[PDB]
């Protein structure tokens, strides 16, 4: 299912298949079903060449066409037009053209997808966003790498290598920094690394565990978990002052904070009721409220950017899977069907979830659309990959 749409190979071998990136982006969203390339009624290279009737016969009311041309200096011009084949046939609904160097060709495709997506759904596109994650390689000296790639797995680069375990990266809302857990000192420490220059700020290294960071959306605070007291509890740092307040205090374990849009409330995982469940608490007036009542276990949540839902790892009768819970109804929908589903993270427009599974025996991340309609494996890495974290809008 999803809205059928025509995505035509772009007019030029071409250095990159821009039309294919657009189709893959739109499909990944769940919201679209780009027509199989072998079943296209034609391959128009321009808006004028589009025959609306041949696309409307197939249930298609919009068509993406475009052009890639070489510039004498070795750069490329990428243009797309979105042509109506429904109520205003032959009309151009959106279009753009821009000049890119060869290494920004995928990015040129993701721009087109973002604009076509927003035009047709009214939802901001997330195809130019990034993911962070940790890979344990088979290298001896620095087996752990914190890496970043495009959301779809291409254009990977290394942010930090370590001889010791890394965990749980988290993006600043401006997209310029990653917080994370490192065991490089011989025990856990929480640090924030600035991506542009690699500078590292030391945030915390209290006795026992320092973990599971999250930046508030307004950019002012970092939430995280400490076990110095005897069990894991939540704390928040005012990033300007460096000051730390305690948020949960109790004998139970409380970890994996995620922010609500207001930058004042956290959801988090607690074992207070026995098996893990998700709770909500104010970082000021402290008294946690249980919010997950389906299944027998729920954990590791990520609240959407509009505050309307969250994703999490939910267990009902033996099966642990990525699930989505409406925060104003308690209604739960199971999204993933893979094995050992863990650590979900939502795209900034709430339309896709990245998470880890048994696919590739640990070496693959997976995408699932939050409507449940589309599922895929990302390109395999050269190691075990864990703790994905989907960037803000960039």
């Amino acid at each position: 299912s999803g809205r059928p749409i025509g995505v035509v190979p772009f007019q030029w071998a071409a250095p990159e298949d821009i039309g294919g990136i657009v189709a893959a982006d739109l499909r990944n969203s769940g919201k679209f079903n780009p027509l199989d390339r072998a079943r296209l009624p034609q391959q128009p290279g321009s808006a004028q060449e589009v025959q609306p009737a041949a696309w409307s016969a197939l249930g298609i009311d919009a068509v993406v066409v475009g052009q890639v041309t070489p510039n004498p200096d070795g750069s490329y011009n990428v243009a797309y037009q979105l042509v109506d084949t429904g109520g205003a046939p032959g009309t151009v609904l959106a279009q753009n053209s821009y000049k890119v160097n060869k290494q920004w060709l995928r990015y040129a495709g993701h721009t087109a997808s973002d604009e076509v997506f927003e035009k047709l759904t009214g939802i901001k596109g997330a195809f130019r966003t990034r993911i962070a994650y940790v890979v344990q390689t088979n290298g001896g000296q620095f087996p752990y790498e914190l890496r970043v790639s495009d959301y779809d797995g291409y254009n990977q680069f290394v942010v930090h290598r370590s001889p010791q375990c890394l965990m749980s990266p988290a993006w600043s809302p401006d997209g310029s920094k990653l917080a994370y857990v490192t065991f490089e000192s011989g025990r856990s420490a929480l640090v924030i690394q600035t991506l542009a220059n690699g500078a590292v700020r030391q945030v915390a290294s209290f006795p026992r565990h320092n973990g599971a960071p999250a930046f508030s959306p307004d950019g002012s605070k970092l939430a995280f978990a400490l076990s110095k007291t005897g069990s894991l509890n939540l704390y928040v740092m005012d990033l300007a002052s460096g000051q730390i307040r305690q948020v949960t205090d109790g004998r139970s374990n409380n970890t994996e904070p995620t922010w609500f849009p207001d930058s004042q409330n956290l959801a988090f995982t607690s074992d207070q009721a026995g098996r893990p469940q998700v709770y909500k608490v104010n970082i000021n007036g402290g008294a946690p409220q249980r919010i997950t009542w389906e299944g027998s276990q729920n954990q590791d949540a990520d609240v959407s950017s509009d505050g309307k839902f969250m994703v999490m790892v939910s267990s009902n009768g033996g099966q642990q899977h990525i699930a989505k819970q409406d925060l104003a109804t308690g209604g739960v929908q199971v999204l993933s069907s893979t094995f050992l589903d863990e650590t979900p993270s939502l795209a900034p427009n709430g339309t896709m979830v990245i998470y880890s599974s048994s696919q590739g025996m640990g070496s693959v991340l997976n995408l699932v659309s939050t409507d449940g309609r589309f599922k895929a494996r990302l390109p395999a890495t050269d190691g075990q990959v864990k703790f994905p974290a989907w960037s803000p809008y960039l």
Partner: peptide, 16 residues
């Protein structure tokens, strides 16, 4: 192994 001691979270012995 690096672990939060929780017995259950994502930072509980994630790397075996």
């Amino acid at each position: 192994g690096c672990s939060d001691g929780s017995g259950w979270s994502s930072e509980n012995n994630p790397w075996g």
